[PDB]
Design an enzyme around this catalytic site. Structure first.
Site, short mmCIF file in Angstrom:
data_model
loop_
_atom_site.label_atom_id
_atom_site.label_comp_id
_atom_site.label_asym_id
_atom_site.label_seq_id
_atom_site.Cartn_x
_atom_site.Cartn_y
_atom_site.Cartn_z
N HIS A 84 0.93 -1.38 0.11
CA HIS A 84 0.10 0.17 0.10
C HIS A 84 0.65 1.32 0.00
CE1 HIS A 84 0.36 0.65 4.40
NE2 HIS A 84 0.13 1.97 4.12
N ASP A 130 -0.31 -7.09 2.16
CA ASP A 130 0.09 -6.07 2.19
C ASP A 130 1.61 -5.87 2.33
OD1 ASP A 130 0.50 -3.21 1.84
OD2 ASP A 130 -0.15 -2.59 3.93
N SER A 146 4.33 2.57 8.12
CA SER A 146 4.14 1.64 6.98
C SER A 146 5.36 0.88 6.28
CB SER A 146 3.04 1.68 6.45
OG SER A 146 2.01 2.37 7.03
#
Ligand SMILES: N=C(N)NCCC[C@@H](C=O)NC(=O)CNC(=O)[C@H]1C=CC(=O)N1
Length: 246
Positions: free
Chosen positions: A46, A97, A198
């Site tokens: 992502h 992800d 992330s």
């Protein structure tokens, strides 16, 4: 990272700092990553979904600071940007992800281990530590979820692995968390990963060895009660990783 502490790249020598070139010449921070082999960094799909051009990215290794240079840092371009074909997401949760970036220097070289740069070990297939285990997370992410800026210094903190049966709880994430994910949180909910973290590592000690057990993916808010950090579960993606790094 909410709470935890400041640190330097030497304490997390596999951390990769991933930036995007902006058309018109400006460069901004995208996400973290982890150096799993000399030429390969692993991160979260992502991070890259809205701009899948490999040419847009730069990867630094050996870097302790966000917008200023660290001695010994190495800079790379992305020769290959591999996003997981089965990536999907909601407003909240992100599935499959996981991403790989193959790095090469302009000089043409993969990373070389030093004081500031080390590879991190993958776990063995389907082998994660038990719930209750203390792992660590590292990132350039927000120090609080309302912040406008990212810290300039790398941070890390410690969180404990939660049970699926437990992350499954309605008070928690229910349906949204699958077996391809792992959950982690502070017992008192005071420290957690936040936006900007992330792609970064969840590192646990497994068989006397620091091992990349997770990749920072999602959560509801940052450090909110009953809402643990969710992480892509590396041990359930080895075949994807080996295949795509062959
Ligand atoms: N560990 C927690 N709590 N969060 C990690 C956040 C990592 C972050 C990095 O870019 N990931 C995302 O933003 C993915 N999307 C989200 O987390 C959504 C879900 C609630 C929200 O506020 N934004």
């Amino acid at each position: 990272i909410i709470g935890g502490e400041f640190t330097t790249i030497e304490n997390q020598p596999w951390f990769a700092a991933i930036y995007r070139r902006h058309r018109g010449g400006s460069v901004t921070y995208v996400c973290g990553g982890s150096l799993i082999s000399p030429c390969w960094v692993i991160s979260a799909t992502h991070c890259f979904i809205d701009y899948p051009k490999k040419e847009d990215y730069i990867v630094y290794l050996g870097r302790s600071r966000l917008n200023s240079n660290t001695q010994g840092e190495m800079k790379f371009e992305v020769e290959n940007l591999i996003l997981h074909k089965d990536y999907s997401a909601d407003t909240l949760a992100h599935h499959n992800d996981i991403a790989l970036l193959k790095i090469r220097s302009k000089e043409g070289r993969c990373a070389q281990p030093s004081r500031t740069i080390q590879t991190i070990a993958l776990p063995s297939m389907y082998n994660d530590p038990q719930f209750g285990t203390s792992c660590e997370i590292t990132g350039f992410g927000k120090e609080q979820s309302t912040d406008y800026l990212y810290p300039e210094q790398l941070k890390m903190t410690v969180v404990k692995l939660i049970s699926h049966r437990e992350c499954q709880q309605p008070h928690y994430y229910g349906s949204e968390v699958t077996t391809k994910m792992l959950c982690a949180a502070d017992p008192q909910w005071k420290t957690d990963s936040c936006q900007g973290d992330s792609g970064g590592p969840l590192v646990c000690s497994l068989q006397g060895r620091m091992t990349l057990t997770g990749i920072v993916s999602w959560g509801r808010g940052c450090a909110l009660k009953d809402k643990p950090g969710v992480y892509t579960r590396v041990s359930h993606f080895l075949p994807w990783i080996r295949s795509h790094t062959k």
